[PDB]
Nucleic acid binder design. Structure first.
Ligand SMILES: Cc1cn([C@H]2CC[C@@H](COP(=O)(O)OP(=O)(O)OP(=O)(O)O)O2)c(=O)[nH]c1=O
Ligand SMILES: [Mg+2]
Length: 579
DNA sequence: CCTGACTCT
DNA sequence: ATAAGAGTCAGG
């Protein structure tokens, strides 16, 4: 049905100043991945181009990098990064259908053009999986079949842009797309392609020493159990703990006895073996994931790892990080924290600079709930995580250990996001009565927060969705469910999503503002990672003084709230030192 | 292939 | 039944 030219060479009419553009990368991980085909749809017609041809054509390369030639795409970051690996700069992306779909409804989980097309009853395009196949069968089809698919995807983007933009505008999300998510996409592309350098010699030595330690811990566990078994098997472990050793069963799941960390910690008064097992499972994860798993994805010639920041995945507007995940590198225990010594600057005489928003979601909550006491506290520049810790453990601001503040931080966020007396009791291993009391007092100190949380649940029931500061939405169709469990989970999403999502809006805006400030001040410094409310950069050592002023300022000023935003920062020779 | 571990925000 | 949002891995 759909006519298109299977071109042998680039022509002028393919180089119009507005086009839908498909630069096709089949591999899920697009770093240094093949570009298999290109499609262009514009006012002059529909074109398929072979990448060997087009990417070596100086005019097409020129067009790609010409910011005044506007392109509409789906997942422009994937294309931009794949092109960077081919030594080509992509500019002028003015519409991204993936990001537009994501903003309209994140629950749709849109991850191909066909799925976004479904949102407007557009059915003249196939899903990628149908065309390429799955798993071991995944392959690029015969050229005519490939060309039609890419053209159909380009035609879809061409026809769907206006309908999607119209609906975003109706929702007050058009700027959220064009001014926030789309510019962020190009920044994330830069960060991913840059990568982070790894000290493989240090990491390999850590791994050798870890293997030795695991063996020792392992044997000690076998001695304590009176038996060899697979400690990494919750099934086998459950038999040892609850049948052989006859320890109390505190919890079961659908598969059998729970051996969760929470459960094992509570069993410590019964048998010392549970502490050893908890240590073993920590060590085993360090080895499998942060030594072996990490070394697996290091590019050997540059020693860099290149994460992918998924910008259209989370239901709240956060990013996630995959292959590897660099947003869950250990920090809480010194043993694991040492992994961060293996993440180093990519040039000699450069340093790692890390900045972190202080009490971020509590500040956002203060602004949104308009809780006068919480607002007062932050205008007063107080630390609410520390105050809660003194309350919980009997101590004062002097005797608050970093571990103390950590445990208290979990209690603060637990309570505002709706933890029960049961959950708080199980968490601090205190009586349910004491836990209930603590929650009651908390909401007495911050009654605006309590009111806000009651009101936001009711609003969500009336409207069917909640919204963030920059107009991001999450729909919650389950929130009027007659079923208690289903309804209760949805109510808690109403309590959390606006706060976590507004905090995401803020750091996203901060990243955009920060790059504009780095370019104008012509600094060599550049972003490496985002970790939800943290930005990690690397820079020549000479730029540290300028960053110490620049970075906190830009982050604190990204939005203006009813309370101040506050950023902490550190720098050093490795990520570990940036503390 | 899922579940239940450990990891972070 | 019992704070929220994420990813990876070994075992099965
Ligand atoms: C740890 C944790 C965190 N969160 C959310 C809510 C906060 C943000 C930021 O994490 P951070 O530890 O920096 O918190 P922040 O308040 O910014 O603390 P700092 O002042 O930076 O220490 O993540 C949560 O919901 N539940 C948790 O158990
Ligand atoms: Mg923080």
């Amino acid at each position: 049905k759909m006519a298109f030219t299977l071109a042998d060479r680039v022509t002028e009419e393919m180089l119009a100043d507005k086009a839908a553009l498909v630069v096709e990368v089949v591999e899920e991980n697009y770093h240094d991945a093949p570009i298999v085909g290109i499609a262009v749809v514009n006012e002059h017609g529909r074109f398929f181009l072979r990448p060997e041809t087009a990417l070596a054509d100086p005019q097409f390369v020129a067009w790609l990098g010409d910011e005044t030639k506007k392109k509409s795409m789906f997942d422009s970051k994937r294309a931009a990064v794949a092109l960077k690996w081919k030594g080509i700069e992509l500019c002028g992306v003015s519409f991204d259908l993936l990001l537009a779909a994501y903003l309209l409804d994140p629950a749709q989980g849109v991850d191909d053009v066909a799925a976004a097309a479904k949102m407007k009853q557009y059915e003249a395009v196939r899903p990628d999986e149908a065309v390429y196949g799955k798993g071991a069968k995944r392959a690029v089809p015969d050229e005519p079949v490939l060309a039609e698919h890419l053209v159909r995807k380009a035609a879809a983007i061409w026809e769907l842009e206006r309908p999607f933009l119209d609906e975003l505008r109706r929702n007050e999300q058009d700027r959220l797309l064009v001014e926030l998510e789309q510019p962020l996409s190009s920044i994330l592309a830069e960060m991913e392609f840059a990568g982070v350098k790894v000290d493989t010699k240090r990491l390999e030595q850590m791994g050798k020493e870890l293997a030795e330690q695991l063996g020792t811990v392992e044997q000690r566990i076998y001695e304590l159990a009176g038996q060899e078994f697979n400690i990494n098997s919750p099934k086998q472990l459950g038999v040892i703990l609850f049948e052989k050793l006859q320890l109390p069963v505190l919890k079961k799941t659908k598969t059998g006895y729970s051996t969760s960390a929470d459960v094992l910690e509570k069993l410590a008064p019964y048998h010392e073996i549970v502490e050893n097992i908890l240590h073993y499972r920590q060590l085993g994860k360090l080895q499998s994931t942060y030594i072996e798993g990490l070394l697996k994805v290091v590019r050997p010639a540059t020693k860099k790892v290149h994460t992918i920041f998924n910008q259209a995945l989370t239901q709240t507007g956060r990013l996630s990080s995959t292959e590897p995940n660099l947003q869950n590198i250990p920090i809480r225990l010194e043993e694991g924290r040492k992994i961060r010594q293996a993440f180093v600057p990519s040039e000699s005489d450069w340093l790692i600079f890390a900045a972190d928003y202080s009490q971020i979601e509590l500040r956002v909550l203060a602004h949104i709930a308009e809780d006068d006491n919480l607002m007062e506290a932050f205008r007063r520049d107080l630390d609410i995580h520390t105050k809660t810790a003194m309350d919980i453990f009997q101590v004062s601001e002097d005797e608050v250990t970093p571990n103390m503040r950590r445990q208290a931080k979990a209690v603060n966020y637990g309570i505002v996001y709706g933890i029960s007396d049961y959950g708080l009791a199980q968490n601090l291993n205190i009586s349910r009565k004491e836990a209930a009391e603590f929650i009651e007092r908390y909401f007495e100190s911050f009654p605006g927060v309590k009111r806000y949380m009651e009101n936001i649940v009711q609003e969500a029931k009336q409207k069917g969705y909640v919204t963030t500061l920059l107009h991001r939405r999450r729909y919650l169709p389950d929130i009027t469910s007659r079923n208690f469990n289903v309804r209760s989970f949805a109510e808690r999403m109403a309590m959390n999503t606006p706060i976590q999502g507004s905090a995401a809006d803020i750091i996203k805006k901060a990243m955009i503002d920060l790059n504009a400030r780095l370019k104008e001040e012509r600094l060599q410094a550049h972003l490496l990672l985002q970790v939800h409310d943290e930005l990690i950069l690397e820079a020549p050592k000479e730029e540290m003084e300028r960053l110490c002023r620049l970075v906190p300022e830009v982050m604190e000023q990204a939005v203006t709230l009813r309370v101040p935003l506050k950023v902490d920062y550190h720098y050093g020779s490795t990520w570990y030192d940036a503390k």
